[PDB]
Amino acid sequence: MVPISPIETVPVKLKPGMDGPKVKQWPLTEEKIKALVEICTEMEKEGKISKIGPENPYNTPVFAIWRKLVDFRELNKRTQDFWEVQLGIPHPAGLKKKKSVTVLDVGDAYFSVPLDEDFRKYTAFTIPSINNETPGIRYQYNVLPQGWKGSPAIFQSSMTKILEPFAAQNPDIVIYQYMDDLYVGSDLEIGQHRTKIEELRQHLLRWGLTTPDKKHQKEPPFLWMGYELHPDKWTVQPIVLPEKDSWTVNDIQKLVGKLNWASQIYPGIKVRQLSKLLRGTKALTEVIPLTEEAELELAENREILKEPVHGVYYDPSKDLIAEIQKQGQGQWTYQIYQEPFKNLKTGKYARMRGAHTNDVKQLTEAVQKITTESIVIWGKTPKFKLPIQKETWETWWTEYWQATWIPEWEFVNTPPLVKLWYQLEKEPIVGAETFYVDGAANRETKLGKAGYVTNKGRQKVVPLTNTTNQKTELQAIYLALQDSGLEVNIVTDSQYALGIIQAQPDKSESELVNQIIEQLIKKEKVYLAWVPAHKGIGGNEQVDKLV
Amino acid sequence: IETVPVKLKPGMDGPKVKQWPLTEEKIKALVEICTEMEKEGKISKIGPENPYNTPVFAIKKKDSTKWRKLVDFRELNKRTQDFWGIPHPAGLKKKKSVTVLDVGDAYFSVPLDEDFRKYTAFTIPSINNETPGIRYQYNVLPQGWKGSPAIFQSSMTKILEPFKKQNPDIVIYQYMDDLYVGSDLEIGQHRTKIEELRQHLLRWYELHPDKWTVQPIVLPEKDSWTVNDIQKLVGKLNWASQIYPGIKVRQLSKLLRGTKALTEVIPLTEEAELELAENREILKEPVHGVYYDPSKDLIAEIQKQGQGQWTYQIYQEPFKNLKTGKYARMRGAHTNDVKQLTEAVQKITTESIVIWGKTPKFKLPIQKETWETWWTEYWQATWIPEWEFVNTPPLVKLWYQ
Numbered sequence: 001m002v003p004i005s006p007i008e009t010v011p012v013k014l015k016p017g018m019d020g021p022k023v024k025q026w027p028l029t030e031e032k033i034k035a036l037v038e039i040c041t042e043m044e045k046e047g048k049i050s051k052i053g054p055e056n057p058y059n060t061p062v063f064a065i066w067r068k069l070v071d072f073r074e075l076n077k078r079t080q081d082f083w084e085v086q087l088g089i090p091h092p093a094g095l096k097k098k099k100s101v102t103v104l105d106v107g108d109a110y111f112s113v114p115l116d117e118d119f120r121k122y123t124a125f126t127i128p129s130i131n132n133e134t135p136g137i138r139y140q141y142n143v144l145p146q147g148w149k150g151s152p153a154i155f156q157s158s159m160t161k162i163l164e165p166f167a168a169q170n171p172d173i174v175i176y177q178y179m180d181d182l183y184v185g186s187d188l189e190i191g192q193h194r195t196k197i198e199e200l201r202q203h204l205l206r207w208g209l210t211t212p213d214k215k216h217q218k219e220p221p222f223l224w225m226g227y228e229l230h231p232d233k234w235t236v237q238p239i240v241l242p243e244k245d246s247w248t249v250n251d252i253q254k255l256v257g258k259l260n261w262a263s264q265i266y267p268g269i270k271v272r273q274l275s276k277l278l279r280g281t282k283a284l285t286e287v288i289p290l291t292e293e294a295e296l297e298l299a300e301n302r303e304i305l306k307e308p309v310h311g312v313y314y315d316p317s318k319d320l321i322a323e324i325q326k327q328g329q330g331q332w333t334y335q336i337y338q339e340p341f342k343n344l345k346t347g348k349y350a351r352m353r354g355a356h357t358n359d360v361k362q363l364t365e366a367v368q369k370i371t372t373e374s375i376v377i378w379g380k381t382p383k384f385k386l387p388i389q390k391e392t393w394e395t396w397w398t399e400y401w402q403a404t405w406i407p408e409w410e411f412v413n414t415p416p417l418v419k420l421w422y423q424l425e426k427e428p429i430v431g432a433e434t435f436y437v438d439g440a441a442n443r444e445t446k447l448g449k450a451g452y453v454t455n456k457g458r459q460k461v462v463p464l465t466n467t468t469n470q471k472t473e474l475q476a477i478y479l480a481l482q483d484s485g486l487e488v489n490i491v492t493d494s495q496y497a498l499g500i501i502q503a504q505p506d507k508s509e510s511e512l513v514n515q516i517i518e519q520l521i522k523k524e525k526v527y528l529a530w531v532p533a534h535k536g537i538g539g540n541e542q543v544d545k546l547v
Numbered sequence: 548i549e550t551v552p553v554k555l556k557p558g559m560d561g562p563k564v565k566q567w568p569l570t571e572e573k574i575k576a577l578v579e580i581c582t583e584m585e586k587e588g589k590i591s592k593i594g595p596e597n598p599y600n601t602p603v604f605a606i607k608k609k610d611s612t613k614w615r616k617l618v619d620f621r622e623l624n625k626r627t628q629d630f631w632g633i634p635h636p637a638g639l640k641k642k643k644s645v646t647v648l649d650v651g652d653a654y655f656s657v658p659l660d661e662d663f664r665k666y667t668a669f670t671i672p673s674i675n676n677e678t679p680g681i682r683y684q685y686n687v688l689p690q691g692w693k694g695s696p697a698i699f700q701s702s703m704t705k706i707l708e709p710f711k712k713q714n715p716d717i718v719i720y721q722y723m724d725d726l727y728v729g730s731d732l733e734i735g736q737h738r739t740k741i742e743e744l745r746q747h748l749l750r751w752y753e754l755h756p757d758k759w760t761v762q763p764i765v766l767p768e769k770d771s772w773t774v775n776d777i778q779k780l781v782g783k784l785n786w787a788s789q790i791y792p793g794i795k796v797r798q799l800s801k802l803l804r805g806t807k808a809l810t811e812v813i814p815l816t817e818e819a820e821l822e823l824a825e826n827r828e829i830l831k832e833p834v835h836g837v838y839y840d841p842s843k844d845l846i847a848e849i850q851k852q853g854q855g856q857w858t859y860q861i862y863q864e865p866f867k868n869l870k871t872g873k874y875a876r877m878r879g880a881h882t883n884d885v886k887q888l889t890e891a892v893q894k895i896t897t898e899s900i901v902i903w904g905k906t907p908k909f910k911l912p913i914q915k916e917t918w919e920t921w922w923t924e925y926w927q928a929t930w931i932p933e934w935e936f937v938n939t940p941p942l943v944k945l946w947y948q
């Protein structure tokens with residue numbers, strides 16, 4: 001009998017100040033009891049468990065569904081925290097093409113790994129005897145129980161420790177490790193590859209790990225985690241979109257999720273009009289009608305999901321390129337590729353929740369997103385093709401009050417182009433009329449006034465109902481813009497209005513602000529000056545709008 | 548050679564902090580470095596029984612192509628028990644010149660308390676989550692930890708004792724992995740003495756505090772004023788009135804009377820000139836009742852002025868500046884705002900370390916996502932400060948210009 005290499009156990013403790021679980025065993029049918037007796041008998045014969053004496057205080061409930069099911073929920077609540085490296089999964093677009101690839105799924109994953117003996121007394125459980133006229137049959141685990149909190153991490157660590165020397169001795173092959181599966185790949189010949197796979201499963205057999213003996217149970221195409229993996233390409237598993245004349249909130253969430261999942265390879269996927277209906281959530285039962293925008297959007301999604309699209313694999317010897325296009329309404333779409341028309345992957349970016357915004361900022365955010373995603377997937381930052389002129393970005397970042405940066409990029413011309421719509425003067429304009437504006441509202445009656453006086457004698461005061469101070473201060477500026485020439489100087493005391501305009505939005509949720517923007521766009525030169533209120537500054541009249 | 552027991556604060560579990568994505572070259576650098584460190588017993592591989600994690604990444608210091616490993620021990624530092632204290636050398640900021648040395652290599656000699664080692668756990672990440680990350684824990688004193696210098700205080704004292712007894716006019720301070728040495732010598736003599744101290748540390752960044760001071764509020768001097776000029780002046784004075792008590796602007800605002808054009812020239816009255824002069828006199832004086840409170844946080848605000856110029860203010864209570872300044876140094880940063888901001892934050896933090904012996908909390912004029920994406924690419928400092936992000940443009944920008 002060839003000795004199998006010993007697998008060192010991982011020391012495990014319960015959470016501090018806690019003790020092992022004691023739970024009353026559930027009553028079972030005689031059939032269930034017999035089934036469990038047989039199963040646990042063969043398991044005890046296999047060494048997975050062992051009978052224990054009455055000394056052990058701790059107990060876990062067991063069920064039969066025959067297949068047994070030990071409910072470790074309480075022990076899981078009482079077991080220590082573990083390090084989980086399973087956050088995130090490998091993305092197909094990040095894989096490098098290999099001439100020969102093998103998939104190995106280890107049978108009896110958790111039952112091949114020994115458990116810390118000082119912890120085995122906490123995994124104890126009992127089998128109810130017939131009619132309960134005898135003491136229940138007591139058992140404890142000697143290996144990792146499936147359903148336990150610590151099983152995946154320990155199994156993973158053990159597997160890694162076992163695989164390390166083979167990997168070190170084989171730089172010519174690459175091994176990916178995921179749960180109960182190993183994915184080997186090489187650019188070697190098929191014979192040499194199969195040979196090295198035999199070597200690997202032998203090396204695993206030395207530690208007592210079983211791999212498929214036959215021709216490996218899975219061959220291309222591989223269906224894995226919503227993906228379809230083919231030898232020369234990857235894609236997603238076929239999309240399923242339910243069609244019903246009555247939609248609930250949960251159905252909306254599921255549809256949104258599905259579309260998001262499809263959007264990583266299918267370019268042009270949009271999800272705004274459907275996500276807007278997720279306001280006032282937490283109620284899963286409801287009937288929400290769809291607008292024409294949402295219906296045409298979903299029809300467009302059915303139009304894109306009409307024919308299959310494939311992504312390619314990654315070649316480190318070629319440059320990494322990300323191109324971005326504006327879709328409108330705060331929506332952005334991007335394609336990451338190396339060869340033209342052949343995408344590695346695709347994606348989208350929706351603007352965040354804000355009162356005001358402009359295209360350049362959103363583009364920047366998109367760039368940051370794509371950058372982080374790229375670093376995760378390929379470990380490098382891609383070169384960018386952006387629908388924005390170099391000179392535009394120059395003016396923007398040079399005059400922007402915030403610090404801002406984009407990595408290496410070039411201008412692609414694919415309209416709509418991102419542009420700066422208006423620019424304020426840094427100095428007062430000579431020969432331009434000077435509009436001193438002001439607005440003020442009554443807090444109680446919600447009645448206000450907004451207007452201006454100018455150096456040429458031009459005046460205006462407009463009365464407003466249902467308004468606030470800020471609204472009148474904006475309204476005054478808007479009035480100054482409406483009734484002035486192509487060039488204009490504007491004086492205001494509103495830190496609010498100046499605060500808004502100095503953020504340079506090209507779009508807003510306030511109609512008044514949008515109109516102010518539309519006015520600015522029509523102007524040639526605009527100088528916006530600020531002064532303190534109620535300082536008795538001449539030309540600035542609070543008394544004119546306070547009547 | 549003897550480990551001193553180190554615990555955490557009551558009711559605080561060890562740090563669990565997500566490791567952020569790293570580029571391939573940085574990952575390889577960290578692999579090489581940590582392998583070499585593992586062969587030297589400085590760190591050891593750990594198992595899944597360790598839940599704790601601290602972020603880690605790679606940088607390149609000044610005048611060096613060699614990658615350096617940097618651990619973000621911030622969370623572990625704030626979760627580490629308070630170590631007690633040496634009063635800050637207030638004479639350090641008063642010295643003519645100060646040189647900063649990297650005494651980090653000395654920490655790897657002293658072993659770390661075993662029971663505490665599980666809290667210094669970190670992870671080298673992999674690209675595309677192909678393989679699980681490599682997990683290490685420290686065996687010796689880690690660089691970047693606040694406990695490491697506190698433990699090495701005695702050792703450092705015994706080592707620097709002869710040099711201290713030799714030159715009583717030389718101030719020596721220690722912060723984290725850095726050793727600040729101040730004096731009044733000549734740059735050549737400074738460099739040679741630094742070589743002497745370095746060789747003294749071997750067998751066992753010129754910074755001039757005198758060329759930096761606080762800054763006053765200055766007002767323009769003009770022969771002729773425009774309506775705009777006077778409006779900006781009145782604005783700045785009205786602002787400064789929040790700081791200086793006796794500022795009045797009524798005689799200047801009286802000039803603006805009526806609605807005139809912004810470019811129209813207004814001659815000043817005698818009352819206005821008098822008021823302006825009085826305001827000048829007021830501004831020439833320092834600020835009333837401004838003190839430093841060691842029990843309070845230091846706040847640093849940074850404004851982007853454009854053309855490579857940046858202004859900053861360190862304070863505790865609003866309108867009570869403890870320090871003001873203007874970083875406009877240009878090295879290789881011409882096309883990159885974020886690099887400029889990062890170097891600015893580093894310099895300000897350094898100054899703060901020299902003056903008060905602790906780092907300030909920053910308020911950065913940058914979007915969170917941008918900064919979080921790019922700040923590690925230009926960070927040469929062994930420590931890290933705390934920061935937040937101001938999303939609303941300040942009006943005071945040109946008032947510090």
Ligand SMILES: Cc1cc(Oc2ccc(F)cc2OCCn2ccc(=O)[nH]c2=O)c(C)c2cc(C#N)ccc12
Pocket residue numbers: 090095096097098099101102103174175176183184185186218220222223224229230231232313
């Ligand atoms: C994540 C991964 C990699 C992999 O394979 C690879 C394993 C190691 C490597 F270095 C490189 C791989 O792939 C590069 C790309 N690729 C892919 C499939 C193919 O047929 N040919 C090919 O070239 C395979 C089979 C996988 C199989 C499953 C399943 N079921 C799930 C995840 C897989």
